[PDB]
Amino acid sequence: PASVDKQLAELERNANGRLGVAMINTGNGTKILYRAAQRFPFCSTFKFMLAAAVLDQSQSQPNLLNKHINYHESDLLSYAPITRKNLAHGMTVSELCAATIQYSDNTAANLLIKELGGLAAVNQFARSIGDQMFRLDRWEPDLNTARPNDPRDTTTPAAMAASMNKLVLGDALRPAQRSQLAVWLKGNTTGDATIRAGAPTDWIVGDKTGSGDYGTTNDIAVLWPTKGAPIVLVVYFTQREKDAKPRRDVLASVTKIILSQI
Ligand SMILES: *C(=O)[C@@H]([C@@H]1N=C(C(=O)O)[C@@H](S[C@@H]2CN[C@H](C(=O)Nc3cccc(C(=O)O)c3)C2)[C@@H]1C)[C@@H](C)O
């Protein structure tokens, strides 16, 4: 809608950035799409796809979520608050999934990628749910360089929204697993300043944040409104200079703007 577009372009233009938006309203099937077929560096938002891949594996492997991983010091990375907390005792795969979603723990992500059988297992999972755009090229934290015109570690807003729709709200997973994935998202701790900040206080938000160089500022969410069906919102944003500061307020403004239309 022209009203959305103008608001989005001014926001985007005013912040000297490139913004990508896909919103799917699962109530009526209406979508709002802005640069939605263009690639953007996903940064930590990939962890959503990773947790889903693990849930997919657990469908054939019923001990998987409860498998205890005794990781070591050398697995610990600069950003690993939960895996650090639990070093002495280790963590289950389930706990690793919750920590990578809700605290964006990088050790937890790398441990789960290894559990799945490597980077290509995550991509093949994305292919298996019909996501042709998602590409994971590097482990954490290298995947967050977000360099101009570098297609490594990118997806499109449309593809990520479609995948979040199918996994959380659709039939890509079995019921126990899709329910678990929604519970993890709803317990996210990193998302207050982004899509959550832009949605009514009486709504429930389940989201995965990501950020990185070039002031990249990303958030992907399912929104549970006070009336009607759930809504999927993906927002990717990146800026001119390598050391740009993230613009979390831009994401909240996008959300405000989009939710006005529905
Ligand atoms: C993925 O986006 C990111 C994971 N997940 C995050 C998140 O969702 O909150 C981040 S970034 C967040 C905003 N700025 C800081 C940050 O950049 N911390 C940071 C980054 C790199 C290394 C280290 C470290 O060496 O300790 C810390 C928190 C969280 C790091 C990517 C970039 O890993």
Q: State how many domains the chain has.
A: 1
- 147: nearest Cα among 215, 203, 83: 215
Token duo for residue 175: 């019921």
Residue 115 sits at the vertex; the CA angle it makes with 57 and 136, to the nearest 5 degrees, is 85
Range of the domain at 95: 2-261
DSSP-assigned states of every residue in the chain = -HHHHHHHHHHHHHTTSEEEEEEEETTT--EEEESTTS-EE-GGGHHHHHHHHHHHHHTT-TTSTT-EE---GGG--SS-HHHHHTTTT-EEHHHHHHHHHHT--HHHHHHHHHHHTSHHHHHHHHHHTT--S-B--S-TTGGG---TT--TTEE-HHHHHHHHIIIIISSSS-HHHHHHHHHHHHT-SS-TTTGGGGS-TTSEEEEEEEEETTTEEEEEEEEE-SSSS-EEEEEEEE-SSTTPPP-HHHHHHHHHHHHHH-
How many CB atoms lie under 10 A from the CB of residue 130?
11
Q: Do residues 15 and 245 make contact, with C-beta atoms less than 8 angstroms apart?
A: no
Please, what's the b/e burial string for 54-93 (b: 16 or more CB within 10 A of its CB; e: otherwise)?
bbbbbeeeeebbeeebebeeeebbebbebbeebbeeebeb
What's the Cα-to-Cα distance from 7 to each of 92, 203, 258, rounded to whole Å? 45, 23, 9
Q: Are strands 154-155 and 91-92 parallel, antiparallel or unpaired?
A: unpaired
**Is 44 an active-site residue?**
yes
Angstrom distance (rounded) from CA 223 to CA 165: 11
Q: Which residues contact 2 (CB under 8 A, 6 or more apart)?
A: none
Which ligand 1 atom lies nearest to the CA of residue 144?
32
Rg of the chain in Å (alpha carbons): 17
Amino acid at the residue 17 = G
Q: From the annotation, which residues make up the binding site for substrate?
A: 208-210
Q: What is the resolution of this structure in A?
A: 1.7
Which residue's CA is the closest to the ligand 1 atom numbered 26?
Answer: 78
Residue 4 CA to ligand 1 centre (angstroms) = 31
Q: Do residues 17 and 215 make contact, with C-beta atoms less than 8 angstroms apart?
A: yes
Q: Kindly report the CATH number assigned to the domain that includes residue 186.
A: 3.40.710.10
Token duo for residue 112: 């789960």
Which residue is associated with the tokens 């998987």? 64
How many CB atoms lie under 10 A from the CB of residue 4?
18
In the set 3, 44, 60, 78, the catalytic residue is 44
Beta bridge partners of 205: 223
Q: Do residues 238 and 251 make contact, with C-beta atoms less than 8 angstroms apart?
A: no
Ligand 1: lining residues by beta carbon, under 6 Å = 43-44, 78-79, 104, 106, 140-141, 144, 190, 209-212
Angstrom distance (rounded) from CA 60 to CA 225: 33
Beta bridge partners of 243: none
